[PDB]
Amino acid sequence: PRVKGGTVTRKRRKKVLKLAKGYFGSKHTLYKVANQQVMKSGNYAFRDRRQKKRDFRKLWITRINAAARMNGLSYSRLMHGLKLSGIEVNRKMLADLAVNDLTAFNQLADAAKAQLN
C-alpha cells in the first residue's frame, strides 16, 4: 500500500502559523521562516520567565531605597537592620507598602533604625 500524506503536513504547518500571529509579514505568512522564529520565541520565553524574577527584584529594591532615603536611610543599612530585627517580610511587600502605605514603611524603618543603635 501507498501513503500520500496530504493532510498532516498542512495541518501541522497551519498550527504553527496560527501560533505565529502578529509577526511582521512573512514571519506570520510563511511556514518555515515563522517556525524558526516561533522556536526562537520559545527560547526567549524560557529566558524571560527567569528574568522576571531578576527584574522585579530590582524594581522593588529601587522603590525601597528611595523610600528609605527619604526616611533617612540606605537600602543596605535598612535591610541589615530588618534582618537583625526579624522583619524578614520580603521586598515585594515592602515595595507595595512604600507605594501605598508609606506610614507602615516608616514604622518598619524606624524599628530597624532603632535596632541599628
Partner RNA sequence: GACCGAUAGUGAACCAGUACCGUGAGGGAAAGGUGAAAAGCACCCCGGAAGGGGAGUGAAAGAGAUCCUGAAACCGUGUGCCUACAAGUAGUCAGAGCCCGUUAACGGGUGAUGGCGUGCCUUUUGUAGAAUGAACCGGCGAGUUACGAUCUCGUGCAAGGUU
Partner RNA sequence: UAUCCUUGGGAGUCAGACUGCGAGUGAUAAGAUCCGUAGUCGAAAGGGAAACAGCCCAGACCGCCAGCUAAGGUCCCAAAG
Partner RNA sequence: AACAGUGGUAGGAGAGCGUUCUAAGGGCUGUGAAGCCAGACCGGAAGGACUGGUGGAGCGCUUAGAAGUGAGAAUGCCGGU
Residues that bind another protein (CB under 8 A): 25-26, 38-39, 41-43, 45-46, 56, 59-60, 62-63, 65-67, 69-70, 86-90, 92-93, 95-96, 98-102, 104, 107-108, 111
Amino acid at 88: E
- Determine, following the binding rule CB under 7 A, whether residue 31 of this chain makes contact with RNA: yes
Write down the least CB distance from residue 35 to another protein, Å: 11
d(CA 17, CA 39): 12
Residue with cell 520567565: 49
For 48, other C-beta atoms within 10 Å of its C-beta total 12
What's the rounded Cα separation, in Å, for the pair 113 and 80? 10
Binding test (CB under 7 A) with RNA, winner from 85, 91, 110, 115: 91
Partner whose binding site includes residue 117, from RNA, another protein, none (CB under 5 to 8 Å by kind): none
